[PDB]
């Protein structure tokens with residue numbers, strides 16, 4: 001009988017496509033040696049043929065989708081003014097107030113993309129024709145309890161359209177085309193949330209809302225934010241989101257501790 | 259005569275390809291109105307045709323270069339253990355000790371890519387055939403004095419090969435092909451540095467060095483690190499590197515304050 005520590009070890013080495021039973025009557029050393037061989041071959045095959053990291057490759061695929069659909073690609077600061085969090089209505093009653101990674105006295109690691117995209121919408125509205133469509137993909141940071149669905153360092157897609165065409169029907173069409181393009185099953189529930197069973201893939205929004213006026217926004221809008229590691233978790237059927245993260249412990253969901 | 263404040267304003271709006279003289283006898287309001295019109299058209303043309311951000315597009319171009327040349331694409335944590343900095347030999351005598359953005363008691367924003375790539379080289383050497391070639395592109399953070407060549411939030415390309423073929427001649431060939439592919443003028447000076455006039459584009463290295471053994475490395479290696487915003491600064495002839503940064507003030511080097 002395998003110890004719980006031994007099965008922990010084997011579970012690190014197990015990939016979802018594997019058809020191996022850790023409850024069979026094979027000794028630990030030989031189950032471990034066979035999984036080690038499979039995971040080394042998996043890495044050798046990535047190295048010989050494609051060589052692309054899942055997170056980078058997904059970011060490039062989402063980028064092509066949104067650029068093709070008319071959205072401008074934004075790359076804005078990750079280290080943001082702390083004032084942005086308060087100005088988002090995030091006071092001490094919200095959970096998010098307590099999840100902020102603070103840096104120095106005035107800055108933080110952004111936990112969200114809405115403040116930076118608000119600022120781009122306001123500025124670009126003086127120069128671009130209606131509607132204004134933008135999107136960004138990049139790191140976001142939140143303090144979290146340990147959890148199979150949560151990372152403290154994760155990657156967010158955020159997109160927003162402002163001006164004409166900002167209907168709920170148009171917002172659902174973008175989400176629906178987007179996730180059918182990626183091959184990810186979903187349900188939209190309605191403020192709107194895109195779910196994969198009990199896992200939240202996205203929260204989406206329809207403006208105007210009162211908060212817009214703090215950001216100098218006074219036009220209707222639609223938008224949403226998606227976690228890239230959650231999309232990878234669903235797509236590759238990982239049991240824990242850490243398999244999809246920026247990590248020294250996993251490469252494309254394969255253990256690097258061999 | 260324009261005030262220094264007025265010429266500051268016009269300099270924000272000026273792009274390097276512009277052929278306008280701020281020392282001519284045209285009033286401020288009319289120089290400003292003409293530059294505003296040119297910069298709005300520049301953004302409208304990006305929005306109508308390509309829609310890609312310079313920094314994202316460069317990162318994708320460098321990625322294709324290195325993947326094609328056999329390097330594995332790494333995406334590793336940006337928030338790293340503080341112990342990594344000391345273990346890199348960065349004590350209080352070095353300047354880099356004082357440039358670290360600390361987070362919580364045990365973590366920091368990575369100022370460099372060498373620690374994470376060391377760890378990947380050690381782990382991947384148990385699984386991949388010789389030589390091992392890897393690369394990463396992503397955010398790095400250093401506290402800096404104000405400067406036309408320095409950002410506190412910047413983007414680093416780091417690549418490293420370990421095992422056979424780790425000669426200085428092979429390292430110079432990678433650098434030379436890489437920068438001729440991007441269309442950036444350079445000189446290699448020799449520890450080796452890749453310069454564009456007085457601006458450092460890259461520092462490169464040839465192992466083994468004594469430090470390798472703290473990281474469990476005992477094979478020869480070659481590698482280098484390049485700042486992406488410095489490559490953009492040179493390529494687009496920006497007078498200040500802030501035009502190339504993750505920014506709310508500039509989009510593809512065009513002022514967003516119109």
Ligand SMILES: Nc1ncnc2c1ncn2[C@@H]1O[C@H](COP(=O)(O)OP(=O)(O)NP(=O)(O)O)[C@@H](O)[C@H]1O
Nearest residue numbers: 142144149150151154200201202203225226227230
């Ligand atoms: N810690 C995290 N790790 C991974 N993805 C995350 C994390 N926090 C948020 N996301 C993703 O970012 C999206 C937009 O953020 P947001 O709606 O604010 O998340 P949220 O409400 O805190 N979701 P949740 O914490 O699961 O209840 C979410 O739908 C997730 O897909």
Ligand SMILES: Nc1ncnc2c1ncn2[C@@H]1O[C@H](COP(=O)(O)OP(=O)(O)NP(=O)(O)O)[C@@H](O)[C@H]1O
Nearest residue numbers: 400402407408409412458459460461483484485488
């Ligand atoms: N603050 C910064 N802003 C932009 N690029 C940077 C910055 N610091 C380093 N880089 C880039 O990263 C490369 C590798 O880092 P490194 O050799 O450690 O820089 P460095 O020695 O501090 N260069 P410098 O500060 O200009 O004398 C450099 O060659 C630069 O191209």
Ligand SMILES: N[C@@H](Cc1cn(C=O)c2ccccc12)C(=O)O
Nearest residue numbers: 112113114158204205223224225
């Ligand atoms: N609120 C999260 C995710 C998010 C929801 N949105 C629905 O409107 C967004 C619009 C733009 C950018 C992000 C989001 C965040 O701010 O990142």
Ligand SMILES: N[C@@H](Cc1cn(C=O)c2ccccc12)C(=O)O
Nearest residue numbers: 370371372416462463481482483
């Ligand atoms: N020392 C800087 C840049 C750098 C120089 N290198 C020369 O060997 C590297 C090799 C791999 C990764 C980065 C670098 C840094 O650590 O990021």
Ligand SMILES: [Mg+2]
Nearest residue numbers: 095142144150
């Ligand atoms: Mg949450």
Ligand SMILES: [Mg+2]
Nearest residue numbers: 193200202203
């Ligand atoms: Mg939500």
Ligand SMILES: [Mg+2]
Nearest residue numbers: 353400402408
């Ligand atoms: Mg320096």
Ligand SMILES: [Mg+2]
Nearest residue numbers: 451458460461
């Ligand atoms: Mg240097």
